[PDB]
Design a protein around this ligand. Structure first.
Ligand code: HEM
Ligand code: HEM
Ligand SMILES: CNCc1cc(OCc2ccc3ccc(N)nc3c2)ccc1Cl
Ligand SMILES: CNCc1cc(OCc2ccc3ccc(N)nc3c2)ccc1Cl
Ligand SMILES: C[C@H](O)[C@H](O)[C@H]1CNc2nc(N)[nH]c(=O)c2N1
Ligand SMILES: C[C@H](O)[C@H](O)[C@H]1CNc2nc(N)[nH]c(=O)c2N1
Ligand SMILES: [Cl-]
Ligand SMILES: [Cl-]
Lengths: 362, 362
């Protein structure tokens, strides 16, 4: 009864995928083989081109991504051949290295073996391959609260953080057959970090803020043609607002606005002074400036919105139905200064796509 | 077949209204009379208390209003007795005067006779009782583009604007029986305007920006117990963002950001400098400051969001189902610094409420 679910989403996928590549004729005799393969193996295997394109189509259908203009330039690394922890670790190490590309960030996705009978071959515990640890115990609040439960879960595994505000979490994943995950501390040479400075406010460095260069999501499930690549970490570059308006700004994250208001020489006393709004802007100016000063790829929300408009234009031209999540597409900084705010989008889910999956810890 | 629509929404309304006022016993013999009145007259008439409460319940169920905490302090003026243009005009004049209250703005609603057989007794053409005119002709762009079509419609009626950027539109409404609307120029003594200045940037006055004190929506339909008060202008006070982030900021409105960026001494050349975001904040600081300096009521988006949180709290306490429109509840300035951003709301429409109705012009 599963071989009809997998088959009907494989009919849809192959037909559409080969249609876009100009291989519509090759559809019929590829579908046939799949029907055979599914029947006799319970599943089927993608070609280099199907997987590569299917992962680009998945990015294209992400309603919450504002950076989908470059969906076709996605660098797809095929690691469906890995069988050991050392291969997975080194694949993850390589991904970090190639995606970072000395700072000229390259949108990349490493794809590991998909679920067989729903069973995960690999099971990545990291939300991102590079993320800061978080600790809270006895009134103490160190690091990133978002990473509190994974951190505690790592410290149940022999790992121990230095309890600075920017402890790199180790890579932690579990292989099929094993009861517990392994962890590997990250080589620092593989991780670029950016110290946040202001272009004209020298006191800003006293905050000692920094962030990591490359955002590599590693807990989402790639679904391509009925096949579940539960482990397929991908990355883009940062939009400045993700760091300056959320990660470093949220009260339930790094909560830096009052400190920012202090170093920029304004009071944080009255709402009518709009001190949070002013601190948000100066902090966000500092983030973009700090990245471009170091030579790490980053985009501002305005430039990103322009690009997304081109994506909309490009979509209508190709007769492609556009889908988007308005609530996630609008930037948390001056959303009304972008075209996104003033129009609506269809939040319909089209496959291939990236999905949430249940965490293994907590 | 209409007397069953009107009756079933009157059953719902009276039952709920009297329940909240503590007059649940009086429900039965009031409903009876209504069934009689509807049968023999085709409609029914609200008491002072039903109309007053029903208009407060309508405000409470406005999913897009962030200022609903004060739903119960709404000043309800009952003008269902008006029959002439002079009465309507003077009622509208009085509303402006009492709502303004020398600057200590009083949330007020004036309620005119409702539709009889769907026929409007009065038909208000103004979007707001106080709004600036807009002109565009031969590359010229004067005033508020939002008011372009009403302005052109007024100039078809013998009215003529001075073509400044802040021409007060006249009151314009049509009475039952007449083919054309009448217009009345507003007494300036009834209209408070606020000149926008900056607390610490003296050059800001060179922009010669100003706005009107009281926002009085007059083109929405109040629906209370199956009865359609198509003409019931209401007002609150301004949230600063409405003036600084939309009215004066939007490209399709006053489009002031580059001029703002100029007077505050920054470049409007690069997106990565976040010049729009910085101009938005300084412009919004100027608006709140300018209103409080003059003594006209205004609220900032932070204080407003706090109040709306109390409204949520007060709603759960009273066992009231909360409804909201997330897309409209979030402020266009730093929405992620408010609790509203980080939670969801049910956009369900509960009556009594305020609705859009089709414009008579254009
Ligand atoms: C190239 C630069 C990219 C930028 C600037 C960008 C920007 C964004 C941003 C700002 C978000 C919202 C994140 C949040 O609010 O927490 C987002 C969501 C998302 N992006 Fe992208 N993105 C990029 C590339 C990619 C790539 C390469 C993929 C995968 C192939 C991708 C897939 C997604 C997905 C799945 C989400 C939704 C995450 C969720 O549901 O929580 N994006 N993107
Ligand atoms: C007391 C101060 C008030 C504040 C600060 C306030 C704030 C707001 C704001 C900011 C909006 C969004 C407007 C927009 O984005 O264009 C809104 C929408 C709305 N408010 Fe209020 N409001 C107040 C009082 C009232 C009153 C007295 C009523 C009527 C009884 C009301 C009914 C509404 C309605 C119906 C909408 C939706 C308008 C639409 O659908 O376009 N509000 N409110
Ligand atoms: C609160 N965030 C929840 C969440 C976000 C996730 O990803 C956000 C995300 C995903 C892809 C991105 C790609 C590029 C980029 N700059 N940011 C990106 C941000 C994934 C899982 C969860 Cl549970
Ligand atoms: C783009 N706006 C459309 C529109 C807005 C309308 O009202 C917005 C509105 C309504 C009530 C308000 C009450 C108080 C306040 N400060 N702003 C308020 C703003 C009414 C009709 C239309 Cl068609
Ligand atoms: C399509 C989208 O809902 C539309 O642009 C909305 C967005 N949110 C808004 N929010 C407010 N307060 N006012 C508006 O006019 C809008 N416009
Ligand atoms: C409930 C609401 O949808 C939720 O708070 C959303 C709002 N919009 C968002 N937008 C982005 N980009 N990221 C988020 O995490 C959220 N959270
Ligand atoms: Cl992040
Ligand atoms: Cl307005």
């Amino acid at each position: 009864e599963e071989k009809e679910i997998l088959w009907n989403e494989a009919k849809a996928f192959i037909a559409a995928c080969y249609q876009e590549l100009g291989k519509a004729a090759e559809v019929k005799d590829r579908l046939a083989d799949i029907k055979s393969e599914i029947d006799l193996t319970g599943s089927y295997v993608h070609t280099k081109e199907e997987l590569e394109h299917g992962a680009k189509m998945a990015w294209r259908n992400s309603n919450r991504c504002i950076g989908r203009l470059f969906w076709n330039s996605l660098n797809v690394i095929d690691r469906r051949d890995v069988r050991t922890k050392e291969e997975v670790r080194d694949a993850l190490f390589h991904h970090i290295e190639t995606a970072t590309n000395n700072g000229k960030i390259r949108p990349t996705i490493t794809i590991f073996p998909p679920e067989e009978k729903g069973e995960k071959q690999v099971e990545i515990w990291n939300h991102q391959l590079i993320r800061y640890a978080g600790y809270e115990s006895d009134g103490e609040r160190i690091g990133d609260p978002a990473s509190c439960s994974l951190t505690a879960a790592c410290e149940e595994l022999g790992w121990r953080g230095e309890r600075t505000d920017f402890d790199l979490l180790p890579l932690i994943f579990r292989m099929k057959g094993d009861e517990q995950p392994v962890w590997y501390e990250l080589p620092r040479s593989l991780v670029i970090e950016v110290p946040i400075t202001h272009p004209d406010i020298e006191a800003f460095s006293d905050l000692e803020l920094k962030w990591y260069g490359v955002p590599i999501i590693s807990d989402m499930k790639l679904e391509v043609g009925g096949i579940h690549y539960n482990a397929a970490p991908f990355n883009g570059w940062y939009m400045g607002t993700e760091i300056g308006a959320r990660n470093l700004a949220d009260e339930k994250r790094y909560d830096k606005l009052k400190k920012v208001a202090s170093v920029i020489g304004i009071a944080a006393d009255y709402n009518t002074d709009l001190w949070k709004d002013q601190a948000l802007v100066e902090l966000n100016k500092a983030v973009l400036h700090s990245y471009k000063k170091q030579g790490v790829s980053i985009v501002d929300h305005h430039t990103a919105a322009s690009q997304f408009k081109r994506f909309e234009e490009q979509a209508e031209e190709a007769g492609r139905k556009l889908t988007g999540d308005w609530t996630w597409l609008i930037p948390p900084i001056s959303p009304a200064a972008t075209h996104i705010f003033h129009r609506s989008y269809d939040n319909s889910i089209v496959k291939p796509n990236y999905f949430y999956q249940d965490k293994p810890y907590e």
